[PDB]
Design a binder for these strands. Structure first.
Lengths: 322, 322, 322, 322
DNA sequence: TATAACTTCGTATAGCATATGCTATACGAAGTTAT
DNA sequence: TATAACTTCGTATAGCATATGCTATACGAAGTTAT
DNA sequence: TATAACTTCGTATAGCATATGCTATACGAAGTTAT
DNA sequence: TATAACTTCGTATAGCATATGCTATACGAAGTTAT
């Protein structure tokens, strides 16, 4: 009783031990759960196994994805475990209902998605077009897409790059030091090398932006309607802005998005990562080098990116034809 | 006791958490476990570790495989876990016998088996014997073998195919939209494409069967003693019937089975998957290309299917033959 | 008290859960320990931390290797843990003394050894010589050394091979199915392929021995002074005999062993394994293929086999010379 | 309390279980931990988790690296474990702050450093400036840099070399028998070979120093202000002096240090190991051949040393430059 | 002034790393239904 | 006391999966600020 | 008959797979000893 | 209250290791059995 209050207070005290995104989702699920409780006059904490089961079933009925329902159950599980109480998943009622919800939906044909690919051809086409622009905005967006495709870095890591994090090989190629990504330990970090062509795109961006006037400035910053860039060492270009670049670029070439409300109708933050992976896959690059390139320590996500590649349509056929 | 009553109720309520195949195996083990308990005067529920141990050794003496003995222990473990009772595997005595049983059987030379390969040489020899037959069942069976060997799909998957899953793509070859995954993080479906010679075979069956009349009709259907097919959209061919096509085709060429009681003396549901990988490998297709063929994410099984091929003899044989 | 008696009785009951070699060493250490106790009128079980420390220190003084002292402490640890009592290593006195004993000895220059290499050149030289012999004994020994070098299998696995475990690729190469080695799980097992030349050596051995007259016969058997081989399906050629073949062969070419009492003065059961590894290492075979060949899932033992190879003496030197 | 008294006695008795360097760091952390406790009025022993947490945050605010903060926690953990008390790391509060401290510092861009490379271009430039000097200390320092760069040995290892460790092997180049391992399962020693131009350098130092008179004399020795060397077999040159040769040689070419207080502004003990790997890699030597060079079993560190080389830019840079 | 180009924000869902049994084919044989 | 051609069963054994804990992206929408 | 060619056996030590912090270099600065 | 050239210290931070649990080989020596 007074012990649960402590563990909770201790978790909040050292919040920063967790990603801000984890806390955001924690509070978001809690809102959903509490709201569902208030409406069935149930106690939201500690949660009762039979109530959690009903809630999960309620989520499934709302039509949410299996992965989304796993998130809600998961946040609940952490709140309880980290407080010293047994997890809702510790009961057969909740554990069996999750299995059932996943089996049913998957049986109904539910399948997780992934970003629309941004490959070499796309990058070449975009470059052939924006190359001739003098606008600070265009020069920045081309440099960004360039680094994204070349390095496979996620939008959060690219937004974190500081001017001082850039070096150069003796061949003239730029180097980008990366320290906190989405996984890894000592603090030695890694260096991402840019091709001769892509370093040129970035160089032009540095020149027209003036972000180099201060090393602790972030590489990318905003550019206002009048074309003046606003370097900053305390503010990064929001990852939301970085997704807008991918989307605006897709609109530029293919026009306005559909009206189906669907996800992945245009390029997004992850497009260059999946497109590059599948360009290498097709190039014959080795599994280890690919994993090296994208920073993977496994091979699953990789395998998934080739799945559906047109270049993997099939062998058995010409195998029968002679 | 009130506790286990609640748990059993939990299990019945969310019984969809497990597939029916799992339930049959569960009931199957419980029946054998209980019969043994009656005959040997022991309580079957809850199961005591010293009793489970005497039974596991009883199975070993019955000459069952290690895989089979692990199934009985596994189901017994499930029954107890989903009942709120401790699992038999968590006791010292049971943990020791399983370890000792596994050690002894492997040391006595016990080995897992796998389907008798059905390769091209076989498909051709079959096609050259059936090809011209005008019998409905002959025209159907050839179309099945072709798809099985072409697509590498399992029998349950071939049973589900509806007429409305076959479209036209590239050269007017047939295309089959399927689903070969059952996990959240996986590909919802997939498109198996057929060669030309195989697409024809399917064309002739569809035209003599009549399953085309209704798009929701299953591609493969029953064909009675009069040589008449019976299209349906409510019932598909049993996987047992599909396995029967494989054995009947073997009889056709080699006659009555070897009677030794052994397994895989003729072709079975997986015969074509074993053969397709060996033929594919013999041509030297990309490892991943062979994996996309059968839907593998790893090579543990495919490696098993091609083990005895000369292409897989290794570096030492390579160094020795200078 | 009565509980410790049970766990022990349970361990002995299911002895077979452990390798016979483990039990042998268990009983051997127990003899050493009990003997040391009887001599200092100490109680051998349960063992007292301060007594175990004194015993370990006593072992070090006797001049035994660090690895040998780790074995004694280890058997003691298992006896106690498996009985339900805390392990002698659970105390700082014992845990600190082991660290110290290892540090001191290693500081004094103690270093673990490894078998004298039996490589390709050696195999060619031996073959060039024994090839022309008509003796059943010579024909058997050449076939054995051949399979050893070609497959890298340990002496225990080679001794276990049954006539029925041999198949052939369509290229004419022999195949040897291996099921229990020194690690691995399902019961599918593995197949070791022999080069065309080595299969010929084995074929000749089968022909002159007649071990094929029964499939459940072990491939290798003894050969008496009059040259008559004695096939058997219940007895294998002792691994001790297999080490004698390596040693006799070394004597045949280099003469009688030294008189230093040292280990690894002649070829032993592991020589072909370390020699083959280092022939591949030198051949440029890939780390994964090598590990594949020797059955390794890591890379440490491998790295150790090249260490000291003459072919790895060094780069920095010619790096400075121009 | 009687219990911890016994444990501390255990630790003192078998103090050889840890190296003196470990003990110094232990005493160093205990001193700082206690001083802080006095100033902040908390008991230093046993250490309470809420107190340890306030101290860990105190270190972070002192601006210490994550590695340093882990050392203080580590030693505190050792002190308690070897005392029979619970370890600070095993408490929720401490586990949370360490996680949060590590997250924050990495996110603020904290990075591990490594020695300023000392490459061939440097060795040549140094040799071309010293080569002809007739000063004892000059003739010694050149011999040290040469061996350091040639052998890739660490400073403690170069300090241990005795005259009786250098023999003649192949072309009359010098050979150095060393020991660079400190684990049971490892190579007891090793033979570092020197180029011709480097073997000469060592020859001249030995002839002007006189360490040869006694084989048990350390290769490298003191050289006073009069330019006279002082061979000894009881005392070796401090590793601090060896580090001093590296900095003095840097001063020689580039002058006074940068004063910013930063680390690795000039060469240090590991400068030659970083440079040797980069030069070696630049020539394209076998990865394993580079590993045997510096005595590595993996590539985690070597990969760090060569990160910014053009040869290590990756597959994407490769695909992009068509 | 309006407005580009963002930033912040909340709900929905993918990425990724580590630990752990459920689900499908095999096949003899009994049961079923239309020739 | 038909039988071809199935389908349904029960039990043995082969073929790959799924649950965990967090951290990060997806995208519409409301708020912000230098032009 | 003797004896090759083993087999069994007990003590010593390597092989191998999985989980977990100790040990060495960095460097300013204080202490030391022979020019 | 010299100073070059060290060595000894204390504290910060980089470089890889070691303890576990079993299972398998190394080799001299005593016992075995068909010649």
């Amino acid at each position: 009783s007074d012990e649960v209050r402590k563990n909770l207070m201790d978790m909040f005290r050292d919040r920063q031990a967790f990603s801000e995104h984890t806390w955001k989702m924690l509070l978001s699920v809690c809102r959903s759960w509490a709201a569902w409780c208030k409406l069935n006059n149930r106690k939201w904490f500690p949660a009762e196994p039979e109530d959690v089961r009903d809630y999960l079933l309620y989520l499934q009925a709302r039509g949410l994805a299996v992965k989304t329902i796993q998130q809600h159950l998961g946040q609940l599980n952490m709140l309880h475990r980290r407080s010293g109480l047994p997890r809702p998943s510790d009961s057969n009622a909740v554990s069996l209902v999750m299995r059932r919800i996943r089996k049913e939906n998957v049986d109904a044909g539910e399948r997780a998605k992934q970003a629309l690919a941004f490959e070499r051809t796309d990058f070449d086409q975009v470059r052939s077009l924006m190359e001739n622009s003098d606008r600070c905005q265009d020069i920045r967006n081309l440099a960004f897409l360039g680094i994204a495709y070349n390095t496979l870095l996620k939008i959060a890591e690219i937004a974190r790059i500081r001017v001082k994090d850039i070096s150069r090989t003796d061949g003239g190629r730029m180097l980008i030091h990366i320290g906190r990504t989405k996984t890894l330990v000592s603090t030695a970090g890694v260096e991402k090398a840019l091709s001769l062509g892509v370093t040129k795109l970035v160089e032009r961006w540095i020149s027209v932006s003036g972000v180099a006037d201060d090393p602790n400035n972030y590489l990318f910053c905003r550019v206002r309607k009048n074309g003046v860039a606003a370097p900053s060492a305390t503010s990064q270009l929001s990852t939301r802005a970085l997704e807008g670049i991918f989307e605006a670029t897709h609109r530029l070439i293919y026009g306005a998005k559909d009206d189906s409300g669907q996800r992945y109708l245009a390029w997004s933050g992850h497009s260059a990562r999946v497109g590059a992976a599948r360009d290498m896959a097709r190039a014959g690059v080795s599994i280890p080098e690919i994993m090296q390139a994208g920073g993977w320590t496994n091979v699953n996500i990789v395998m998934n990116y080739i799945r559906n590649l047109d270049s993997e349509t099939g062998a058995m056929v010409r195998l029968l034809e002679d």
